[PDB]
Design an enzyme around this catalytic site. Structure first.
Site, PDB file in Angstrom:
ATOM      1  N   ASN A   9      -7.855   8.879  -5.364  1.00 14.36           N
ATOM      2  CA  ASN A   9      -8.710   7.885  -6.050  1.00 14.36           C
ATOM      3  C   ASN A   9      -9.592   8.518  -7.091  1.00 14.36           C
ATOM      4  O   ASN A   9      -9.843   9.704  -7.090  1.00 14.36           O
ATOM      5  CB  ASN A   9      -9.570   7.172  -5.013  1.00 14.36           C
TER       6      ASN A   9
ATOM      7  N   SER B 184     -11.873  10.789  -3.517  1.00 15.82           N
ATOM      8  CA  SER B 184     -11.333  10.549  -2.215  1.00 15.82           C
ATOM      9  C   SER B 184      -9.830  10.364  -2.334  1.00 15.82           C
ATOM     10  O   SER B 184      -9.268  10.262  -3.443  1.00 15.82           O
ATOM     11  CB  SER B 184     -12.003   9.333  -1.583  1.00 15.82           C
TER      12      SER B 184
ATOM     13  N   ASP C 265      -6.377   8.339  -0.312  1.00 11.77           N
ATOM     14  CA  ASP C 265      -5.879   7.351   0.633  1.00 11.77           C
ATOM     15  C   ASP C 265      -4.656   7.915   1.382  1.00 11.77           C
ATOM     16  O   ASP C 265      -3.792   8.528   0.767  1.00 11.77           O
ATOM     17  CB  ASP C 265      -5.406   6.092  -0.120  1.00 11.77           C
TER      18      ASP C 265
ATOM     19  N   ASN D 276      -8.829   5.432   3.410  1.00  8.16           N
ATOM     20  CA  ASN D 276      -9.501   6.347   2.488  1.00  8.16           C
ATOM     21  C   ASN D 276     -10.501   7.306   3.149  1.00  8.16           C
ATOM     22  O   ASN D 276     -11.238   6.941   4.059  1.00  8.16           O
ATOM     23  CB  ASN D 276     -10.122   5.520   1.348  1.00  8.16           C
TER      24      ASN D 276
ATOM     25  N   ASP E 223     -12.712   8.449  -7.498  1.00  6.39           N
ATOM     26  CA  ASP E 223     -13.950   9.011  -6.963  1.00  6.39           C
ATOM     27  C   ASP E 223     -13.732  10.331  -6.237  1.00  6.39           C
ATOM     28  O   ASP E 223     -14.677  10.895  -5.694  1.00  6.39           O
ATOM     29  CB  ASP E 223     -14.685   7.976  -6.071  1.00  6.39           C
TER      30      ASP E 223
ATOM     31  N   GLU F 248       0.816  -1.219   0.000  1.00  9.16           N
ATOM     32  CA  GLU F 248       0.000   0.000   0.000  1.00  9.16           C
ATOM     33  C   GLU F 248       0.844   1.261   0.000  1.00  9.16           C
ATOM     34  O   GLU F 248       0.539   2.199  -0.729  1.00  9.16           O
ATOM     35  CB  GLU F 248      -0.920   0.033   1.214  1.00  9.16           C
TER      36      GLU F 248
HETATM   37 CO    CO Z   1      -6.684   2.372  -1.747  1.00  5.05          CO
END
Ligand code: CO
Ligand code: CL
EC number: 3.2.1.17
Length: 129
Positions: free
Chosen positions: A46, A50, A52, A59, A48, A35
């Site tokens: 992201n 958002s 992370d 998120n 959308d 990650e």
């Molecule tokens: Co993610």
């Protein structure tokens, strides 16, 4: 902060992640590697809208408030910036809520795709724990 592999494993163990909801420590180290590459400061946007945050790429749509994600639920009741600290407490505490939400560690797509079903013990091999 960029953690070493064993340094992160030790910190995760101290914060009670080893076998948390049945997930052995190697699972958590493996998820963090893919990650964030063990970097507490990692951020990624992201599709959308958002973002992370942190070592476990938590998120902003569901878990933390970054002030730019409309309809954020902020279920961990934290600013997302708190998840970028060298001290992993906030990230761990929020991760415990996420893994308890029904889908276990499948909540982390990198864990599902790169760690699940592999020899995750390898991630803690050699470490003084
Ligand atoms: Co993610
Ligand atoms: Cl599970």
């Amino acid at each position: 902060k960029v953690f070493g592999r064993c340094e992160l494993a030790a910190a995760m163990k101290r914060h009670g992640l080893d076998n948390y909801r049945g997930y052995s420590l190697g699972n958590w180290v493996c998820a963090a590697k893919f990650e964030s590459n063990f970097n507490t400061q990692a951020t990624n946007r992201n599709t959308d809208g958002s973002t992370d945050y942190g070592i476990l790429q938590i998120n902003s749509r569901w878990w933390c408030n970054d002030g730019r994600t409309p309809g954020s639920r902020n279920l961990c009741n934290i600013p997302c910036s708190a998840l970028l600290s060298s001290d992993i407490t906030a990230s761990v505490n929020c991760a415990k809520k996420i893994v308890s939400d029904g889908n276990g560690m499948n909540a982390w797509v990198a864990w599902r795709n790169r760690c699940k079903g592999t020899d995750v013990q390898a991630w803690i091999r050699g470490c003084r724990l």
